[PDB]
Amino acid sequence: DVQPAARGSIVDRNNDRLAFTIEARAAERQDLRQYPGGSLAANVVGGIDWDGHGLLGLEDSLDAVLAGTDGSVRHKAVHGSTVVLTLDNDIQFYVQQQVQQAKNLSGAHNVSAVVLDAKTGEVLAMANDNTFDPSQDIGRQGDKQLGNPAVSSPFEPGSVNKIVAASAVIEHGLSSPDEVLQVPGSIQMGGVTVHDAWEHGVMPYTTTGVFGKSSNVGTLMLSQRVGPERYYDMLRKFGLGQRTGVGLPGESAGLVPPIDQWSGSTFANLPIGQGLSMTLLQMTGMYQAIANDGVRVPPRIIKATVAPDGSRTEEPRPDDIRVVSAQTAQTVRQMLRAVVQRDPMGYQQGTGPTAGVPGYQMAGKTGTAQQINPGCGCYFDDVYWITFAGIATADNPRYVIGIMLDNPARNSDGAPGHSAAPLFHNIAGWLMQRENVPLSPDPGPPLVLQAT
Numbered sequence: 001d002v003q004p005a006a007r008g009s010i011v012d013r014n015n016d017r018l019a020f021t022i023e024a025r026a027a028e029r030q031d032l033r034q035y036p037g038g039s040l041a042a043n044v045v046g047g048i049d050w051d052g053h054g055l056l057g058l059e060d061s062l063d064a065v066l067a068g069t070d071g072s073v074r075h076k077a078v079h080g081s082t083v084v085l086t087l088d089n090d091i092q093f094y095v096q097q098q099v100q101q102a103k104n105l106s107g108a109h110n111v112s113a114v115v116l117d118a119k120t121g122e123v124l125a126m127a128n129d130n131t132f133d134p135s136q137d138i139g140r141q142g143d144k145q146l147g148n149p150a151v152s153s154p155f156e157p158g159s160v161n162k163i164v165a166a167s168a169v170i171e172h173g174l175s176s177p178d179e180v181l182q183v184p185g186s187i188q189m190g191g192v193t194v195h196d197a198w199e200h201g202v203m204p205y206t207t208t209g210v211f212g213k214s215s216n217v218g219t220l221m222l223s224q225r226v227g228p229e230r231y232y233d234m235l236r237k238f239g240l241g242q243r244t245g246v247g248l249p250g251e252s253a254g255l256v257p258p259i260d261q262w263s264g265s266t267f268a269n270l271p272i273g274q275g276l277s278m279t280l281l282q283m284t285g286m287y288q289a290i291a292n293d294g295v296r297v298p299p300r301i302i303k304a305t306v307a308p309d310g311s312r313t314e315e316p317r318p319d320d321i322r323v324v325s326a327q328t329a330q331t332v333r334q335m336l337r338a339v340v341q342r343d344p345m346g347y348q349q350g351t352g353p354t355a356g357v358p359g360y361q362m363a364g365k366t367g368t369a370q371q372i373n374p375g376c377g378c379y380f381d382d383v384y385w386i387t388f389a390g391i392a393t394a395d396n397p398r399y400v401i402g403i404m405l406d407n408p409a410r411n412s413d414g415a416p417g418h419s420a421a422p423l424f425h426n427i428a429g430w431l432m433q434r435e436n437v438p439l440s441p442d443p444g445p446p447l448v449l450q451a452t
C-alpha cells in the first residue's frame, strides 16, 4: 500500500556528494545513509536517525526538503529534493585538516575556520577540530564535536574588531592611513584606564600603524573622533548582534549592548573588541564587507535545490548592505596589509608578519581577547581567544578567511607564541597556488606604521 519517498542527497557546489541513500535489506527494505567523506563537513551536514530522518545538522533542519512525502495506492510519492551547498569539498577538506592540526600543534581547546567567497559571501568552507563521524553511532562519540561552533558559539573578538573603528574613521573623513598620530602608552577613558600590550611613551604611529601594531590607545583616540552614535551605527551595519540567516541550525546572534544601555565605560571597550560577542561567521562576514568594496553580502551555505525530476532552483541571494564606500573599503584593505608587513628593524612590522604570503597583497588583522573567568564574573589574565581574519588579496579580493583558536599554548603551527597568523598563511597561500593566481613582482613600497 505505501510507496516510500527516496531521501534526497546533500552535495557540494560541484555536485560532489556529501550524503546520499542506498537501498538495502533487513520491515525488510532498509535505506542506508552513506557519508563518503566521513567527517568531512559533518559539522554542517549532520547525521541520520534510526528511521532515516535527520538527527542533527542540515539532515534535520532540511529534513522536510530531503525526506519528501510518502505515496500511497492514489497519491504519488514525492522523492526528496537534493540540497546543493555552497561548500567546495576540496577547500573544506584542506581547511578541516589544517584546523585539526592547528588544534594539535597549538594546544588550543578548540579551533575553527570559515572561508567566504569575497564578492558573494558564500561559505566555501566551515570547519572545527574534533568533528564527529556521521557514519558511526553518535552515542559512542561523546568525546567528539557534534555541532557547529563557527555559527553556534560566540566569543569576544578583541582586536579583530578594530576593522569597525578603522572603517568608521576613514568613511567619515576623520583620518587617513598616513596621518601621523601621537599615541601615549595609556589613557583614561570612560572612567577606565586602557593600556597597550607593550609599554611605550608617546609614539608617532600612523593610523596605518595603529591597526598594524594593534595599539588599543590609538584605536580609542581615533574612536573618540567617531563618537558613540556613529560607531554603534557601524557595528550594526557590519552585521553584529544579529543572525546572518546563513541557513544553518543553531546559529547564535552574538551580543552587542545597545547604545541606550551603554555604561560610562562601554565605549572604552567595544572598539578594541571587548564587551560584545560574535560568532566566527559574523567575524568573517565583517571582512567580507570590506573585501566586497564596502558592500556586505550576508553569508549563505545553501546554494540551490534540485527537484526529483532534475529541475534546479537557485537559492535567493540576500540583499546587499552598504557598510562603507568602495573607496573606504579599498583604503582599509590596503592599511591592513601593514598587519602582515615584515621589518627586521621591528619599526615597520605588524603583529602578523607570518600571515603574509610573498608575491601577494595579503591583508588581515590579529586579535587576542581575554576570556571571562566563570567563577569570578571577571576577565582571565592569561586565557585568550586568538583570532585572525584576512582577505586574499587586497588588490583583488577572492577569499575571506576567519580563524579562532580557543586559548592555545603555541602558534597554530607549533612555534612558540599564541598567533593564528600561521594558519591564515597556510590556507591563503594554498588557495592562491591551486587557482594559479598570479604573483606581483613589486609589492609597492613598504607601508609606514611608525613615523619619527
Ligand SMILES: *C(=O)[C@@H](NC(=O)[C@H](N)c1ccccc1)[C@@H]1N[C@@H](C(=O)O)C(C)(C)S1
Pocket: 157, 158, 159, 160, 196, 197, 213, 214, 215, 216, 272, 351, 366, 367, 368, 369, 370, 384
Ligand atoms: C587586541 O586583540 C588587543 N589585545 C589586548 O588588548 C588584550 N587585552 C591583550 C592580551 C594579551 C596581551 C596583551 C593584551 C591588541 N591586539 C593583540 C593582537 O593584535 O594580537 C595584541 C597582543 C598585540 S594587544
Ligand SMILES: [Co+2]
Pocket: 074, 075
Ligand atoms: Co486521496
Ligand SMILES: [Co+2]
Pocket: 417, 418
Ligand atoms: Co605566552
Ligand SMILES: [Co+2]
Pocket: 425, 429
Ligand atoms: Co609558507
